[PDB]
Amino acid sequence: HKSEVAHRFKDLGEENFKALVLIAFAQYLQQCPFEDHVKLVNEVTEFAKTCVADESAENCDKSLHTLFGDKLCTVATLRETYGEMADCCAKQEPERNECFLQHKDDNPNLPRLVRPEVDVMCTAFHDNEETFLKKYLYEIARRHPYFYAPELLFFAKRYKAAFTECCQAADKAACLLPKLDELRDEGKASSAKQRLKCASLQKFGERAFKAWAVARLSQRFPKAEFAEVSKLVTDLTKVHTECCHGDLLECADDRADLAKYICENQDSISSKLKECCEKPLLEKSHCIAEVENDEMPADLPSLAADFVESKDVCKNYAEAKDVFLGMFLYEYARRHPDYSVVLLLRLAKTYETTLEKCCAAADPHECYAKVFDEFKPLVEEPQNLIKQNCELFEQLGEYKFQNALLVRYTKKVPQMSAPTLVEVSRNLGKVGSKCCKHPEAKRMPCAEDYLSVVLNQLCVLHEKTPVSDRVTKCCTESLVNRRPCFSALEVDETYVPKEFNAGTFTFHADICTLSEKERQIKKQTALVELVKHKPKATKEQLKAAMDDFAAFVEKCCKADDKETCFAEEGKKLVAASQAALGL
């Protein structure tokens, strides 16, 4: 178009345009103060209104990359505050926008989002609603630079709703706080999911995302024809490719167009969309995206006929491998609405590898005839794994379960630092809380989808600051087989252990003034260190060494002279610990 900034403002309207630019700015420049970003958004908006009023006004044909970059580089040149982003401002477009995209920080060193008291929030909401809600967008966007922008608009609407509803409740806290906690959790999940979506596009290629989409949509829309599902997948793929590349205005605009198309072609898509399609734009798109699975069309013929028995299997596969496997995935996925997509993708992959081998054999039909018998074990391995972990989670409680995983992952990746390993164990450990409470049939798909999400977070950060070649291999070899790869890792024996050294051991009394849960993180650091001093350590050697640690912290924290005791009892703990581990 003659003016991209006019076109998007006209298609999106001012409210959403401004919200999306705020999001864009906050995601490129995560460290930038709220007030500066709002300033930049207002000026871009002033410029959009001008171009809408007169599409030939000066600079109205500049790309949105150039405009946003121009605005970001009025502050991002300050290296003291903005770091490697100053390099991006030293460049011209398009290299400049590409540099910003590479510096999106997945682990921002940013303060926890503590709530004020309910009254202070409600007062702030009444006094300046507009500013209050932009801060929400800012604070979430900047902590989650790949958060799906259109959905964040929806989250902002829900956040507004909670305040509108609760700030005059008889008990404001009781109304408001549970709403805000739900949103916080849904936002974290949503961001984590989108990050995995962007990673699959960017690091495993467009077909990786298309296969995920066909799978999920076929479960959701199982009465739609393959052709209809592909159309939807193509549009969905364009949408996410634009969002994941920081092209948020175009992303939100194409998404609205997808939503509209779906709602005008319901008879071709699903019977569950009627109420979704009566709603306003953001609710509409959110609803369509979360709508319950349509009923499956009944007495469906087997997959044997088209994917095993037919004489045209190898031919149809040879001309159009991704399409043919798309058809497989569509037919399999729509019949199994209860399966994790990761599992479905793993089965499609298995079928793909089978045809790759067998269609070059003298008798392809006989070679691949039993291909479906490969599946049942691949369905059962995770079920059993999750059953064992859930039982273990229930027997140990959350803290000891995390401890058990922390030992596991330190053994797997001793090159990681203690705080990383503690974070990874905490997040893996949440699989038990989030999934093990669900009925057995929903446990496994919950667990497998959540674990893929957490591991992907570990992977995108590890690629930036790598420490284990094994992690890199598990991160890069196969997206769908990530969890099994990390599961199969035994103790790393390339790693040279930390030697014990009484003389450099230093521990101060500052742990005594810590809370229960802050003191637990110290016990967890102690655990990580023990393992790094002997990766092959057994559970019972570690139990003993940990018992020495806890007795050492309990002795000196109750002692009259606390700092002397940690000084004095340090040499013996080290000797005791070393003995516990068999040296």
């Binding site: 050294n501 009484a502 003389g503 040499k571």
Partner: protein
């Protein structure tokens, strides 16, 4: 350029016969960084002696702390042996207690 190591031998805490302690050999002010240091007990090289990181001072000269856990006695004689390109012969400094 080349600088000769300076060598100090001392214990971590005030020496007390029978009480456990650490013996320290601190070698400093030398260049280049390649240096051979041994602690000795009654003239014999001690086997598993630990050392800090080879670091350096504001004037660029190198320094290094070697140490071992020990329990002083009346009878036992400790010392530090240091070799380095600037030394024509390896240098022995004896542990003289509280000196």
């Amino acid at each position: 350029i080349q600088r000769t190591p300076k060598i100090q031998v001392y214990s971590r805490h005030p020496a007390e016969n029978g009480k456990s302690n650490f013996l320290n050999c601190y070698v400093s002010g030398f260049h280049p960084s390649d240096i051979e240091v041994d602690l000795l007990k009654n003239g014999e090289r001690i086997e598993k002696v630990e050392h800090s990181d080879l670091s350096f001072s504001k004037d660029w000269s190198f320094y290094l702390l070697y140490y071992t856990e020990f329990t002083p006695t009346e009878k036992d004689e400790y010392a530090c042996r240091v070799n380095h390109v600037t030394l024509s012969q390896p240098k022995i400094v004896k542990w003289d207690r509280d000196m």
